[PDB]
Amino acid sequence: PKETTIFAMHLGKALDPNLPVFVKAEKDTNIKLVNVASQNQTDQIQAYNLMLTEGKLPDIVSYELSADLENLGIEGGLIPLEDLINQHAPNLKKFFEENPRYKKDAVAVDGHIYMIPNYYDYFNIKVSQGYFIRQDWLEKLGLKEPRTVDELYTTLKAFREKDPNGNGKKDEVPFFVRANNVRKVLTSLVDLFKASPIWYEENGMVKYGPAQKEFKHAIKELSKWYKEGLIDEEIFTRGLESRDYLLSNNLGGATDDWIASTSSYNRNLADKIPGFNLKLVLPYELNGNAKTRHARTTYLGGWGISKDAKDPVSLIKYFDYWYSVEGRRLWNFGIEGSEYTLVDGKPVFTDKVLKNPDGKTPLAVLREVGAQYRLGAFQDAQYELGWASESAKAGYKYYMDNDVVLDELPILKYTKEKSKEFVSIDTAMRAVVEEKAQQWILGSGDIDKEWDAYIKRLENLGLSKAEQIQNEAF
Numbered sequence: 474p475k476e477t478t479i480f481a482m483h484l485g486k487a488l489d490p491n492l493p494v495f496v497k498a499e500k501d502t503n504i505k506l507v508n509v510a511s512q513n514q515t516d517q518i519q520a521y522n523l524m525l526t527e528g529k530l531p532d533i534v535s536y537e538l539s540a541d542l543e544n545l546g547i548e549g550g551l552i553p554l555e556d557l558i559n560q561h562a563p564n565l566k567k568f569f570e571e572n573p574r575y576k577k578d579a580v581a582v583d584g585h586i587y588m589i590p591n592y593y594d595y596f597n598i599k600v601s602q603g604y605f606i607r608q609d610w611l612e613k614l615g616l617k618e619p620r621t622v623d624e625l626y627t628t629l630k631a632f633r634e635k636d637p638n639g640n641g642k643k644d645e646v647p648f649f650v651r652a653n654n655v656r657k658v659l660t661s662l663v664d665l666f667k668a669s670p671i672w673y674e675e676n677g678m679v680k681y682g683p684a685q686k687e688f689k690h691a692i693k694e695l696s697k698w699y700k701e702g703l704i705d706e707e708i709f710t711r712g713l714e715s716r717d718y719l720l721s722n723n724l725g726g727a728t729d730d731w732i733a734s735t736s737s738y739n740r741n742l743a744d745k746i747p748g749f750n751l752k753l754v755l756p757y758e759l760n761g762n763a764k765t766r767h768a769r770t771t772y773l774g775g776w777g778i779s780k781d782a783k784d785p786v787s788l789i790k791y792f793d794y795w796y797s798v799e800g801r802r803l804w805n806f807g808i809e810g811s812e813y814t815l816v817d818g819k820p821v822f823t824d825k826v827l828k829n830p831d832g833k834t835p836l837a838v839l840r841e842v843g844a845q846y847r848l849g850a851f852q853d854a855q856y857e858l859g860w861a862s863e864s865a866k867a868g869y870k871y872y873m874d875n876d877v878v879l880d881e882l883p884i885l886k887y888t889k890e891k892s893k894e895f896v897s898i899d900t901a902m903r904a905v906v907e908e909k910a911q912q913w914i915l916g917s918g919d920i921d922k923e924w925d926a927y928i929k930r931l932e933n934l935g936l937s938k939a940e941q942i943q944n945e946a947f
């Protein structure tokens with residue numbers, strides 16, 4: 474083949490086209506990808522901004538920030554795909570016919586399609602993160618299961634002070650999160666206090682979570698929990714390895730994280746830590762409120778074909794390949810005879826995935842062969858149900874049955890008059906939020922003295938204009 478250039482990062486890692494999934498895709502489609510993001514880049518947003526200054530765009534642009542990606546299309550950097558799809562992408566075309574909601578997510582406000590989203594299998598699994606606590610630490614120490622935020626605070630204090638891992642050292646990390654940027658840290662910390670670090674919907678108004686009184690109260694409580702030693706001291710400096718590191722060393726008491734992979738640890742660690750029992754509870758109640766805002770969106774990011782691509786028909790065929798039964802199965806499941814075998818026509822995972830010798834979660838084993846690499850694919854809940862423990866599957870139903878999960882805001886799209894403006898204000902407000910929230914949590918300053926000055930900064934940045942744009946797009 475010739476070479477196809479791509480910008481693609483995911484979870485801090487530039488796509489390696491020599492992973493088995495992409496080796497197989499190259500064999501099946503004759504596209505040989507070359508990534509213009511280097512293996513040293515770890516921050517997708519910084520790498521994407523650098524990529525935009527380096528001359529020709531790569532043939533394929535993949536990005537997690539889908540309003541920014543669409544903005545690149547509005548400005549001519551990505552081409553419209555709807556006619557390429559109609560002529561040359563029968564798998565996509567049929568996908569759009571059968572999934573009218575997913576079709577709407579692909580269409581920009583001007584009626585062009587500029588990216589194929591990376592879709593979750595949203596109509597089969599919408600829940601995502603839940604709350605987990607060490608049942609076995611509860612039992613070793615005599616405690617009832619906390620049901621409220623203030624009972625949790627008291628339980629975590631007991632995890633910090635009364636040595637539940639029985640080694641005589643004060644090493645317990647009562648509450649921890651899994652994240653590779655400040656926004657993901659905040660997502661997993663402030664939902665506990667019913668706040669949000671992003672936009673959300675409330676009585677048909679779209680609101681900026683970091684400007685709300687709930688957020689101020691969240692940062693103020695988190696401040697106090699951090700200073701007391703209840704929240705991981707290194708919460709802002711670890712990366713995606715935190716969960717694995719803290720559970721496998723028996724340091725971690727409690728977290729807020731994705732149900733299937735977090736549930737997988739009872740089996741992962743059953744021999745390393747006898748009695749290990751990290752158990753899912755419903756969101757803790759805060760003054761009556763028992764809801765969480767953790768839910769899946771219909772998609773996360775996407776990819777599109779740049780205006781510098783020399784051959785768009787063969788790239789829309791590459792996009793389409795991932796929507797065929799074989800390409801979609803390859804993206805979700807890895808390699809036949811390695812990650813899965815076909816039993817009665819259907820993929821069933823092998824024990825390399827299900828029972829990894831070395832303490833790896835099933836998902837982490839799949840990501841090592843290049844499966845589930847966020848691009849523009851259609852995730853398949855059968856892959857997730859294929860490795861989820863029985864307690865994960867009981868976990869999904871427990872959250873749905875109890876109506877604790879507030880549905881995520883639809884991913885909003887902007888007119889060409891507003892999209893540049895919206896995305897600039899969001900970015901600038903985000904930096905102020907992440908810098909103040911991190912400095913408040915860690916103990917500098919005083920959020921009660923500094924709050925109004927903070928809100929005025931977000932307003933100077935264009936908060937009201939951003940709320941207007943949001944509400945009109947809603």
Ligand SMILES: CC(=O)N[C@@H]1[C@@H](O[C@@H]2OC(C(=O)O)=C[C@H](O)[C@H]2O)[C@H](O)[C@@H](CO)O[C@H]1O
Nearest residue numbers: 651657731732733734735773836845847857
């Ligand atoms: C689309 C994507 O890659 N999403 C990432 C999350 O992946 C989900 O993880 C789990 C699970 O952990 O139980 C199940 C879903 O099938 C899978 O998509 C990932 O957990 C987080 C970590 O921040 O990032 C999302 O991007």
Ligand SMILES: [Ca+2]
Nearest residue numbers: 636640642644
């Ligand atoms: Ca200890």
